[PDB]
Amino acid sequence: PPMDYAGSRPRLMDHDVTLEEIHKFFVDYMISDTLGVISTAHLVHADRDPEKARSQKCLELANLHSRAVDFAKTGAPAEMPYALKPREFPDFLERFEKPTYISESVFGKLYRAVKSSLA
Amino acid sequence: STMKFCRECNNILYPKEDKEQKILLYACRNCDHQEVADNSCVYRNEVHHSVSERTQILTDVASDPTLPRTKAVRCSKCQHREAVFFQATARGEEGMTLFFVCCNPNCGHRWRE
Amino acid sequence: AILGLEFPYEILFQLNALVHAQKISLFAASDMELIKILRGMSLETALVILKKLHQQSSICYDPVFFVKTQMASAYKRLTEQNIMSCQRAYVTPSKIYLLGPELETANYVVKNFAEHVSDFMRVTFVEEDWSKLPANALSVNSKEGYFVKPSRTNIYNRVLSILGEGITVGPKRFEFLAFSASQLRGNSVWMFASNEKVKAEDIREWMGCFRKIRSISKCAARMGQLFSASRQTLIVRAQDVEQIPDIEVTTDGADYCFSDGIGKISLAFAKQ
Ligand SMILES: [Zn+2]
Ligand SMILES: [Zn+2]
């Protein structure tokens, strides 16, 4: 079954826009903008823990991703938790400064095949 | 609940209404003196709940209820399930929106719905 | 105030862009001789020599010697392939970099306002390395009292002041018009220089009336949605439009709507 598509409650103001709160929203959009890290964390957690997309961690990541993609429509921050950070990246990434771990998933096999073909 | 003393004999006055005069008047029963009223106010009391005097400390009347607590929600900064939820208005928004406060003594994090 | 003359805006903008680039310093182009030479000349030749100087591989020390040794269509482009020259600006916490009149695809807002092609300027807020601003540079968290409360940094106030007062480049002052959905994810915003003919408020009210929307994000989204690249077609009045009812189904206590943005078109409309 698919996940629920019900979004957050809309925020309605009691007064008209005075061109200041829109600037506040535009500046605050940079803060707590975790749209790009949720997908990376989900991929890392799927590659690490077997039986991926079955545990509650993947469901929480998907819900957070939906809430973050709803940020541009409704003013609801994603609120990315600290404990869900990957702190580890597979070989098929450009994060050379970050620690690299050898992945044994299907993506790891594909990357090894590509490396062997190029070499 | 107001009271005043007529300048003639310095005695309490009771309010009364006259159909012909169509105005508020005060006259005491001690002397036949009638004076004009001011502000047309005969009763003014601030509503208070101080009825059970010297009894609200022994028996818990529960004047200020405690906020409910839930364990279904999960905090973000810490992995604690207990949190306090309540409804309150925003700074400029309309309606009631749900809030959450973490119950972890070492977390101190609050977030909206 | 140093110039105090009728110097054009395009040449001044090009000079500012060249100074911002690591080609010529500030005082090397602020002398009287350079502006005296650049004041009265041919405009096309002046633009050609300015862009040639901007194309110099290394840093130029003497601009006067270089410039001594060196010596309509917009509407058609918009109608053909929507080709416009839009100014792009980069605002950093330290300074501001002007890229220059880079060619880019034109949007709908410049179709009916093609005479102010130079008043439109794209402003992007980046870091010193022209990268995205980190979350620690804006509203750093601090534990004050029983609960944690974010504390706004000076960069936050600087961005607010830039958005409010606006950016002044020569004899112009750019004002905030709107930002598209893609620009919100790229920290970009459109700015239009107010003129005696049409101001920013005039364009804003010409696009539509946004006072009906009571949501902060929804109002911005609706104001910025009409900035995508598109091809101009014929004009249709408001006399022949239908009001077909839609279909809704409510199962398991959930509102599921089949028709979200679906529509209906004819064959003659497709041919036209
Ligand atoms: Zn009396
Ligand atoms: Zn907590």
UniProtKB/Swiss-Prot annotation, chain A:
RDR2 is non-functional in the absence of associated Pol IV. The gene is RDR2. RNA-dependent direct polymerase involved in the production of small interfering RNAs (siRNAs). Binds to single-stranded RNA (ssRNA); engages ssRNAs longer than 7 nucleotides and initiates internal to their 3' ends. Able to transcribe the RNA of an RNA/DNA hybrid, the transcript produced by Pol IV, if its 3' end is accessible, to generate double-stranded small interfering RNAs (dsRNAs) precursor essential for establishing and maintaining DNA methylation. Belongs to the RdRP family. This is RNA-dependent RNA polymerase 2. It comes from Arabidopsis thaliana. It is found in: Nucleus, Nucleoplasm; Nucleus, Nucleolus; Nucleus. Disruption phenotype: Late flowering and absence of siRNAs derived from FWA tandem repeat regions. Loss of de novo methylation. Increased expression of retrotransposon-derived solo long terminal repeat (solo LTR) and SDC due to their derepression; levels are even higher in the double mutant rdr2-1 jmj24-1. Interacts with NRPD1 and SHH1. Associates with Pol IV complex, forming an interpolymerase channel bridging their active sites, through which the Pol IV-generated transcript is handed over to the RDR2 active site after being backtracked, where it is used as the template for double-stranded RNA (dsRNA) synthesis. Interacts with JMJ24.
UniProtKB/Swiss-Prot annotation, chain B:
Keywords: DNA-directed RNA polymerase, Metal-binding, Nucleus, Transcription, Zinc, Zinc-finger. It is found in: Nucleus, Nucleolus. GO terms for molecular function: DNA-directed RNA polymerase activity; nucleic acid binding; zinc ion binding. It holds the Pfam family Zn_ribbon_RPB9. PROSITE patterns: RNA_POL_M_15KD, ZF_TFIIS_2. Transmembrane segments: none annotated. Zn(2+) 1 binds at C6, C9, C28, C31. Disruption phenotype: No visible phenotype; due to the redundancy with NRPB9B. No effect on methylation at RdDM target sites. Nrpb9a and nrpb9b double mutants are embryo lethal. GO terms for cellular component: nucleolus; RNA polymerase II, core complex; RNA polymerase V complex. Zn(2+) 2 binds at C75, C78, C102, C107. It comes from the Eukaryota. Pol IV and V functions are not impaired in nrpb9a mutants and Pol II functions are complemented by NRPB9B. DNA-dependent RNA polymerase catalyzes the transcription of DNA into RNA using the four ribonucleoside triphosphates as substrates. Component of RNA polymerase II which synthesizes mRNA precursors and many functional non-coding RNAs. Pol II is the central component of the basal RNA polymerase II transcription machinery. It is composed of mobile elements that move relative to each other. Belongs to the archaeal RpoM/eukaryotic RPA12/RPB9/RPC11 RNA polymerase family. Component of the RNA polymerase II, IV and V complexes. Interacts with NRPD1. This is DNA-directed RNA polymerases II, IV and V subunit 9A. The lineage of its organism: Eukaryota, Viridiplantae, Streptophyta, Embryophyta, Tracheophyta. The gene is NRPB9A.
From Swiss-Prot, chain C:
It comes from the Eukaryota. Disruption phenotype: Late flowering and absence of siRNAs derived from FWA tandem repeat regions. Loss of de novo methylation. Increased expression of retrotransposon-derived solo long terminal repeat (solo LTR) and SDC due to their derepression; levels are even higher in the double mutant rdr2-1 jmj24-1. It is found in: Nucleus, Nucleoplasm; Nucleus, Nucleolus; Nucleus. RNA-dependent direct polymerase involved in the production of small interfering RNAs (siRNAs). Binds to single-stranded RNA (ssRNA); engages ssRNAs longer than 7 nucleotides and initiates internal to their 3' ends. Able to transcribe the RNA of an RNA/DNA hybrid, the transcript produced by Pol IV, if its 3' end is accessible, to generate double-stranded small interfering RNAs (dsRNAs) precursor essential for establishing and maintaining DNA methylation. Interacts with NRPD1 and SHH1. Associates with Pol IV complex, forming an interpolymerase channel bridging their active sites, through which the Pol IV-generated transcript is handed over to the RDR2 active site after being backtracked, where it is used as the template for double-stranded RNA (dsRNA) synthesis. Interacts with JMJ24. RDR2 is non-functional in the absence of associated Pol IV. Belongs to the RdRP family. This is RNA-dependent RNA polymerase 2. The chain holds residues 285 to 567 of 1133 of the full protein.
